[PDB]
Design a protein around this nucleic acid. Structure first.
Ligand SMILES: [K+]
Ligand SMILES: [Mg+2]
Ligand SMILES: [Mg+2]
Ligand SMILES: [Mg+2]
Ligand SMILES: [Mg+2]
Ligand SMILES: [Mg+2]
Ligand SMILES: [Mg+2]
Ligand SMILES: [Mg+2]
Ligand SMILES: [Zn+2]
Lengths: 86, 56, 151, 51
RNA sequence: UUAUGCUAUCAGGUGGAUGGCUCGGCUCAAGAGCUUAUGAAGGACGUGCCAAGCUGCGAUAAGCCCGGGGUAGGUG
RNA sequence: UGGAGGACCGUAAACGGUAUUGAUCUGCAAAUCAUUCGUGUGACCUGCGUCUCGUAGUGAAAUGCUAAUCUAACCCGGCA
RNA sequence: UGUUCGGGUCGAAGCAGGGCUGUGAAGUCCUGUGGACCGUUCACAAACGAAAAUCCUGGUAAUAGUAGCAGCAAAGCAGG
RNA sequence: AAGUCGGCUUCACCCCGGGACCCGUGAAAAGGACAGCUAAAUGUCCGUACCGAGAACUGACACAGGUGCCCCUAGCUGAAAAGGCUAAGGCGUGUCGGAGUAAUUCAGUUAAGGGAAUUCGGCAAAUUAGCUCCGUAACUUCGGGAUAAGGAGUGCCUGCU
RNA sequence: CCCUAACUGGAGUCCGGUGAAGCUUACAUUCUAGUGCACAGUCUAGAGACCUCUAGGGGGAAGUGAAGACCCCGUGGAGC
RNA sequence: GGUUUGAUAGAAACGGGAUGUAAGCACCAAGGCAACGAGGUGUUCAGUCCGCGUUUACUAACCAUUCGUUCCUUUCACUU
């Protein structure tokens, strides 16, 4: 069951250094890496909600947001569940 | 248009068909002759002495 | 699930749609994977497991608003015209409509007794000669010259 | 959809059924001495000289 | 434990030389020497229980019939 | 009004091949690519069919073209 | 090849390395490996000796974990 | 599940008719029609899958060429089958990925002030650009030059002729 | 162009996978001069030089590609 | 360089900046019988944004590993 239920604002400015058409999956990778380091889990145990992925791809592959606010929950199995947050 | 690979894309036809008499794909579809065995030109089989060397 | 690609192709054939129009239930994947025949696909289609997604057309409403304004004579000025005057209104069609209107007007005037054959012939040749811009111009010439046999 | 006569299609059919591997029992019988034959081919290569 | 290397040998890998073997080839000699409309040679296609090639055979299709030789195995 | 012309503009329709002396130059390609260009109702372009060939043919003629071969093709033979 | 005299499964030819002899061409022996053939006298023959031919055929390096897997249509991501 | 109606337009398709041009005249033959109606029987043979091309063809290739763009193609903008944005249909295989950090390089965007001083040479790039109206020179074979040149306008909304 | 700068995408750079080719008698960390078939990394005398690796543009290797197509020669050709 | 004995990076807020006054709402709007109506004004130096700073341990600088011994050994300065 749940262990921690913290809300995060994940900055995505480092995503912008990548070539412009690669920015959306670079931002996906940044969100996953942020969750890995801040929740202290593995990359494969970080599950990204459809809200997060659809928000990162809203304006195309070249214009992801400069930040994203997410709600991540960690379980005893080590799995992390991340969803978009208001 | 280059004389090389470009003009080689127009190769969608044939000048020689399969020969009834000999089975070789040598029957000229225009001259109606087999260039291998002579079918469609002669009742005999096409043979020349220059098909081998002078036997000496 | 292994490939459901065979089922998707068969379902697009059975539904008569494109391959990507076919929707396979992501929850009923093993039910779909057991479907081998056209009858099985028809059963899945009838029970809603397989359906054809709605065609996303091209909406034409904002074109309708623009077309209404253009019918009123707006949104059609010189900064909107791109084709030559002649591609937007061909000249032979203009002449055809003009001369046909004039000739029909003259024919009806001769028929209903307002115009005798002598002046009808000359008016017909005048219309053929581009003397009148329209039916209104021809009527105005008739009334100014008093060529109509009024009673 | 080129149009073949009866004989041209028969020769194509013979070419097609020649393009089969040697049977496994032949390989067993010959003690791995006959494992292939010269009529193996692929359809997308130098074409047939048959039709 | 001085790496990257250099030289020689050894073990192994790769490779297919060498040797040995050979139902094949080549040359010479002696024989024998025409065949096909009674449809030849040649080719195509087919033909095997599992058979793709070659070989044989021809819808009687790796074969059918008769006589002789051979005799216990055969099914290229 | 009419609708002529080896008329005009123009298509990454089709045909051609100017310049970049660009890319490429063990290439995507034994001649291609991008951009820029010429023709685009006519001596037009093009499919299929058919004919004309080696001292011969074909050529609005460059010795161009005749199967990546052309101031005499290619194959075999003369030929060791 | 003719001819004389031999060796070999108690291990021939060949192969890798070594000892000895010979100015040398080379010969012989030893160890290992190998599994069936090999020499020798006097003579006679020849399709008889290779480091070279941008030699031929096969095998295999350096180059090098390098070039390429970009340019003409930059396409993938989440969840299952 | 509805499944009933109207209207507009109509290419690039069908029918029909006219005109113009030619020192160019634009195929032939089978077949068909003009007297056939009713019944029964017969209609053999070959092809037929699939690709038809940025992977099924051809160029040694899953080849940026060629064959074929050969014949077809929906909505808006627009003269348009241009270009752009979208359907349907086809795809994410014009079959390597990751990473985001140097120089250099292929292809682009922008650039003060100057404006061809560059260079063999304005090569390359930039400028202009649609449509409407005004206006248009030398010269001319009287046809043209000509879109010469040079000027003005252009969006949206409301109401109209 | 003065006189270049910044930025965009693709390469490159670094990582994983895949994976060739072309120069090569040998050796080789060179530099200067001389010498020598008079244009030397190797000869001579000096001067330098610890090795390995990476990136980088191309000074040199009279770099690589091609039995010079210019010239002459050949009692060699071809066409005209 | 910093690593809780901490402002290293990020969040939050604020400072300092970029742009130019968001959406919705109300009033006006040439006119239209009306429906509507480009647009103007107020709300509103608003809205959006910051690859700068500050404050602030809120999350992450945690948990380790490895060398500083030739390795096995008792060729031991050792310990079952
Ligand atoms: K079909
Ligand atoms: Mg040629
Ligand atoms: Mg002879
Ligand atoms: Mg034109
Ligand atoms: Mg010869
Ligand atoms: Mg040798
Ligand atoms: Mg890459
Ligand atoms: Mg002489
Ligand atoms: Zn023949």
């Amino acid at each position: 069951d749940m262990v921690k239920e913290q809300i995060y604002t994940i900055p995505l400015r480092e995503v912008r250094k990548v070539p412009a058409w690669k920015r959306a999956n670079r931002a996906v990778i940044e969100v996953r890496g942020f969750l890995v380091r801040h929740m202290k889990t593995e990359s494969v145990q970080v599950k990204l909600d459809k809200s997060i992925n659809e928000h990162l791809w809203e304006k195309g592959c070249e214009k992801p947001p400069l930040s994203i606010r997410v709600r991540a929950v960690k379980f005893a199995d080590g799995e992390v569940q991340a969803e978009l947050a208001q | 248009m280059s004389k090389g690979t470009s003009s080689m894309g127009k190769r969608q036809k044939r000048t020689h068909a399969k020969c009834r008499r000999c089975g070789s794909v040598s029957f000229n579809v225009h001259t109606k002759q087999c260039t291998s065995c002579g079918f469609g030109k002669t009742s005999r089989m096409r043979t020349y002495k220059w098909q081998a060397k002078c036997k000496y | 699930m292994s490939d459901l690609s065979n089922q998707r192709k068969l379902a697009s054939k059975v539904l008569g749609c494109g391959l990507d129009r076919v929707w396979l239930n992501p929850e009923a994947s093993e039910e779909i994977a057991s479907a081998i025949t056209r009858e099985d696909i028809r059963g899945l289609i009838e029970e809603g497991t397989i359906k054809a997604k709605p065609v996303k057309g091209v909406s034409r409403g904002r074109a309708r608003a623009l077309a209404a304004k253009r019918k009123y004579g707006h949104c059609k000025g010189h900064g909107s015209r791109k084709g030559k005057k002649g591609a937007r209104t061909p000249k032979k069609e203009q002449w055809i409509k003009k001369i046909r209107a004039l000739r029909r007007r003259l024919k009806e005037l001769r028929a209903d007794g307002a115009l005798d054959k002598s002046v009808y012939c000359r008016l017909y040749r005048k219309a053929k000669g581009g003397e009148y811009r329209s039916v209104s111009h021809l009527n105005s010439h008739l009334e100014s010259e008093k060529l109509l046999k009024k009673e | 959809m080129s149009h073949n006569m009866k004989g041209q299609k028969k020769r194509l059919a013979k070419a097609h059924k020649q393009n089969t591997r040697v049977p496994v029992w032949v390989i067993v019988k010959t003690n791995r001495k006959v494992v292939s034959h010269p009529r193996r081919r692929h359809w997308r290569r130098r074409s047939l000289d048959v039709k």
